[PDB]
Amino acid sequence: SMSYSWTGALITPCSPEEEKLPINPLSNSLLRYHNKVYCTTSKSASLRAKKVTFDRMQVLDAYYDSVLKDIKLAASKVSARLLTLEEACQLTPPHSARSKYGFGAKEVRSLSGRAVNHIKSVWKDLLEDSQTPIPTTIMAKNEVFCVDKKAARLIVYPDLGVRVCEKMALYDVTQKLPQAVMGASYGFQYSPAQRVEFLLKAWAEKKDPMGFSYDTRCFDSTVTERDIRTEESIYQACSLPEEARTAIHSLTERLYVGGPMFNSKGQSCGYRRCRASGVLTTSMGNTITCYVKALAACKAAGIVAPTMLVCGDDLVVISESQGTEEDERNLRAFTEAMTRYSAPPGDPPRPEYDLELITSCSSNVSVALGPQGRRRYYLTRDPTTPIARAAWETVRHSPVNSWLGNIIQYAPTIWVRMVLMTHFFSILMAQDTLDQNLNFEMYGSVYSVSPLDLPAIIERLHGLDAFSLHTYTPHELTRVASALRKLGAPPLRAWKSRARAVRASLISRGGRAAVCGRYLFNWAVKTKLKLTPLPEARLLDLSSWFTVGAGGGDIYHS
C-alpha cells in the first residue's frame, strides 16, 4: 500500500543543472532581485521522494459506489477508435524525450523506418503480453520559482516507443470520455473566457453561494492500484474495438498501475504503485478519479447543490451556503470523506464568499471595464511565477517556453499587457525574430505559434475587449504591484513609459508588426485608436484548442 519503494539509487540529472538566475542585462531590465529566482534541480530530488512516499489507506462506501455506478453508465455513451500510427506520431512534440532504441521525436514525427518498425513491435508485444511490467525513467523536473525553496517535482515516464502506443490505444478516449461522464464540470475543455463564464454562472445560480478549492496532498501519490484499475473499468465501459480493449488492459496492468523505475544512469531506482506523472492518462485519470471521490464526498458531507470544476487534481466546488458554521462543518466532513477515499488534504479547505478570491488552477475571475464603460470579466492569477519564469527564459532559451503561453492565456490582464508584452516585443524586435514560430506549453500541453499572430489569436479567444480593458480592481492592482516590488521589477508606470517606445517601433515596421503595435499597445497612448475586428481572426481554427490538449501528456498541436 506504499506509493513507492526505493533501492537507494539516486535520482540523477541528464546534464548539469543551473539553480540560480544568471546576472544578465536583458533579464535585469525585467527584474533586479535575481537571487530570489531559482530553478529546482536533482539536488532536492531525495527530499521530494520522501514527501511523496507514504502508505495509502483507502476505504470506500455506498456514496462512492453510487457515483461510480453513474459514471460507468455515462461512459457507455462513448464510442472511440484506435488512432492510426501516423496520427499518433503527429501528436508527438518535436522535443519529446528520445528513445533508447535509436531514434528521437524527429524520427517519430517524420515516420522514419527505424521509429515505425520499433513502435510496431511494441504494439504487438502489448497485445500478446498483459503482465510484464514496463520500465520507466524517473527524473527531477527543472522548474523556476520565486523564493518565499520548493523541492523538485518528480516525473516518471515510459520509453518514447510506448508513449506512441498509448496514443494509438487511448488518445481518442481522452477526447471524449471526460466530457461524457462529467459534462460541464470537465475543466480542460474551456478556454480562459469560457472558464470565467462557467464560474460566474455557477456562482450566480446559487441563492447564497459558497465556494472552496480542495488541495490534495501529492495527488498522484494518493492514487491507488485499485483506483487505476477502476479507471480502466471506466475506459472499458466505452464502446471500443477489441484490439484497443486488449491494449488498454495491457497498458493498465504493465504501466499505469505501477512498475519499475530507473534513473538516467540505468540503475534500478525503485518501484511505483501509484499514478505515473508522465503517461498519456495522467490528466484524464486524475480528473475522473478526483471527480468520483469529490462527488461522493460532497454527498457524504451534505454539500448542497454542488457545482464542480475539475482539472486533473485541481478541484473547485461552488454550492449553496448553509451558514458560516454549517459550511465549516460540512467542509470538515468533506475532507474526512476525501481522506477515507485516499485523498487527504495538503492545506485544509476553507469556505470563501467572494468569487474573486477563489482560486482554480492557480487562477481566479476578476473584473474591469470595457471601452464602453461596461463591466467585463476575465481570468487572471498572481504574476510572480510567470514573471520569474519569463526572466529565466529571456536569458536561457527553452525549446518549450511558458511566457508565450502566459501571454495567450492571460492576454486581458494588466500584467501581461503592461509587462510581458512590452518586454518580449522589445526583445523580439531587437533579435529581429518577431515572425519566428515558438513552442510553448499551456494546460500542460505543447503548442506552436508566431507572436506576430497574437492579436488575431487574442481577439478570437478573448474578444476585442482584451485590447481595451481598464480600471482593474484594487485586489488585482495591489497584487501585481506587490509582485513587481518583490521581484525588484520596475513599477507599472515605468512599463507604460517603455511601452510607448515599443509601440512606436512596432508601428514603424508596418505589416503584421504594426498591427501588433496598434492593438496590443493601444493602452499605452492617451489618444486611443479605433480597433476593429481582425479578418484573420475568423480564419483561426480554434474551438477545441484546449480539449485536444486533454490536460498534458506529451501532446503537440500545429
Find where cell 504494439 sits.
123
Find where cell 490536460 sits.
551
For residues 262 and 138, is the Cβ–Cβ distance under 8 A?
yes
Length in residues, the chain: 558
Could you tell me which of 450, 434, 462 has the C-alpha nearest to residue 376? 462
- DSSP string over 189-200: G--HHHHHHHHH
Could you tell me which of 369, 337, 340, 512 has the C-alpha nearest to residue 429? 512
Determine the distance from the C-alpha atom of residue 247 to the mean position of all C-alpha atoms in its chain, rounded to a whole number: 27
Return binding residues.
215, 313-314
The H helix count followed by the E strand count for the chain is 22, 16
Burial call 245-264: b when 16+ CB within 10 Å, e when fewer: ebbbbbbbbbbbbbbbbbbb
Dihedral over Cα of 37, 39, 43, 48: its sign:
positive
For residues 362 and 119, is the Cβ–Cβ distance under 8 A?
no
Residue 235: what are its φ and ψ, rounded to 5°?
A: -60, -45
Residues contacting 428, CB < 8 A, separation 6+: 434, 451
CA distances to 285, 400, 439, 482, 514 from 96, rounded to whole Å, are: 21, 10, 12, 37, 35
Residues contacting 124, CB < 8 A, separation 6+: none
Q: Which residues pair with 65 in a beta bridge?
A: none
Strand order in the sheet with 136-140: 4-6, 268-272, 259-262, 136-140, 154-158
For residues 390 and 21, is the Cβ–Cβ distance under 8 A?
no
Cell numbers for 165, please give them: 502506443
Determine the distance from the C-alpha atom of residue 220 to the mean position of all C-alpha atoms in its chain, rounded to a whole number: 14
Q: Which amino acid is at 3?
A: S
Dihedral over Cα of 27, 31, 36, 42: its sign:
negative
How do beta strands 154-158 and 304-311 pair? unpaired
Give the separation between CA 232 and CA 252, rounded to whole angstroms: 7
- Resolution stated for this PDB structure, in Å: 1.9
Cell numbers for 235, please give them: 475506459
Give the separation between CA 300 and CA 350, rounded to whole angstroms: 18
Residue 173: what are its φ and ψ, rounded to 5°?
A: -60, -45
CA distances to 104, 225, 508 from 94, rounded to whole Å, are: 9, 32, 35
Give the separation between CA 216 and CA 312, rounded to whole angstroms: 11
For residues 549 and 443, is the Cβ–Cβ distance under 8 A?
yes
Give the separation between CA 341 and CA 354, rounded to whole angstroms: 29
Give the separation between CA 392 and CA 385, rounded to whole angstroms: 11
Give the separation between CA 29 and CA 502, rounded to whole angstroms: 14
Could you tell me which of 201, 258, 252, 200 has the C-alpha nearest to residue 230? 252
Give the separation between CA 37 and CA 505, rounded to whole angstroms: 31
Angle (CA) 75 79 83, round 5°:
120
Residues contacting 374, CB < 8 A, separation 6+: none
Give the separation between CA 349 and CA 328, rounded to whole angstroms: 9
| Per-residue DSSP letter, 360 | B
Give the separation between CA 73 and CA 159, rounded to whole angstroms: 34
Cell numbers for 483, please give them: 509582485
Residues contacting 89, CB < 8 A, separation 6+: 108, 109, 111, 115, 119, 164
Determine the distance from the C-alpha atom of residue 521 to the mean position of all C-alpha atoms in its chain, rounded to a whole number: 28
- DSSP string over 184-232: GGBGGG--HHHHHHHHHHHHHTSSSEEEEEE-BTTHHHH--HHHHHHHH
Give the separation between CA 282 and CA 259, rounded to whole angstroms: 15
Ramachandran bin of 46, using left for φ above 0, alpha for ψ from -120 to 50, beta for the remaining angles: alpha
428 CB neighbour count, 10 Å cutoff: 20
Q: Which amino acid is at 157?
A: Y
Find where cell 480592481 sits.
473
Could you tell me which of 141, 151, 149 has the C-alpha nearest to residue 46? 151
| Per-residue DSSP letter, 239 | B
Strands (DSSP E) found in 395-463: 400-401, 438-442, 445-449
Determine the distance from the C-alpha atom of residue 540 to the mean position of all C-alpha atoms in its chain, rounded to a whole number: 23
| Per-residue DSSP letter, 306 | E
Angle (CA) 26 379 497, round 5°:
35
Strands (DSSP E) found in 15-142: 37-39, 136-140
Cell numbers for 364, please give them: 481566479
Return binding residues for Mg(2+).
215, 313-314
Dihedral over Cα of 96, 97, 100, 102: its sign:
positive
Q: Which amino acid is at 138?
A: I
Residues contacting 219, CB < 8 A, separation 6+: 275, 286, 290, 312, 313, 343
Cell numbers for 435, please give them: 515572425
Give the DSSP H/E element, type plus range, for residue 144: strand 144-146
Dihedral over Cα of 526, 529, 532, 535: its sign:
negative
Give the separation between CA 274 and CA 222, rounded to whole angstroms: 7
For residues 346 and 217, is the Cβ–Cβ distance under 8 A?
yes
- Find the largest Cα–Cα distance for the chain: 70
Give the separation between CA 407 and CA 402, rounded to whole angstroms: 9
Could you tell me which of 439, 376, 437 has the C-alpha nearest to residue 405? 439
Could you tell me which of 257, 44, 265, 6 has the C-alpha nearest to residue 141? 44
Q: Which residues pair with 309 in a beta bridge?
A: 316
Give the separation between CA 427 and CA 361, rounded to whole angstroms: 29
